[PDB]
Structure 1
Amino acid sequence: MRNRVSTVQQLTKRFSLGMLQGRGPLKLFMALVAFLRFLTIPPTAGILKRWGTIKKSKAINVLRGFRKEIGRMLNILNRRRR
């Protein structure tokens, strides 16, 4: 009964047989990781272990762009995009 992590098993059970890939595009990866971590469900073990495929530059820019998009949407919601 050694489950690696319920996060990946979720993705495995998703639909029927999920594709448990370590991702590639940091947008997709970080979006998925964000979706997990910001909701409540702990990110997949390999994420906390090796961050999948996060290089400490492009992924950083990805995060920057992410919070930028968030700031834009925040501006839209609060400021009505002025």
Structure 2
Amino acid sequence: NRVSTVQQLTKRFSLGMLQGRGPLKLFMALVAFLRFLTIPPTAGILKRWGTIKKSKAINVLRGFRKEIGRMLNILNRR
């Protein structure tokens, strides 16, 4: 329903989140992205991985698994 411009997306992504900065849900998504593509993380990203609150991080990861399931349903029904 909504679209982004390429320029709009690149403004939002910053060098800071290569160092693992950012909100938890954003950080979790970036970690998952690298893992999908088997891309090693940076030390800064890696250091935040141990920092995160496990309870809050687990719930965010479950939401991703749910969203992957929604995408699978979409692709199956086609």
Q: TM-score range by the shorter chain?
A: 0.5 to 0.7
Aligned partners of 2:54 and 2:61: how far apart in 1?
10
**Which stretches in structure 2 are left out of the alignment for 5+ residues?**
none
Indicate the RMSD between aligned Cα atoms, in angstroms.
9.0
The size of the alignment, in residue pairs, is 78
**Superimposed CA distance per residue, residues 17-71 of structure 1 (whole angstroms, 9 cap, x where no aligned partner):** 6665432322110111111111021122344455154211111000000110111
Quick check: which one's helix share is greater? 2
2:36 and 2:5 map into 1 onto residues whose CA distance is 14
Structure number with larger C-alpha Rg: 1
Q: Compute the TM-score of the two structures, normalised by the length of structure 2.
A: 0.63
Give 5+ residue unaligned stretches, structure 1.
Answer: none
User: Could you state the TM-score of these two structures normalised by the residue count of structure 1?
Assistant: 0.60
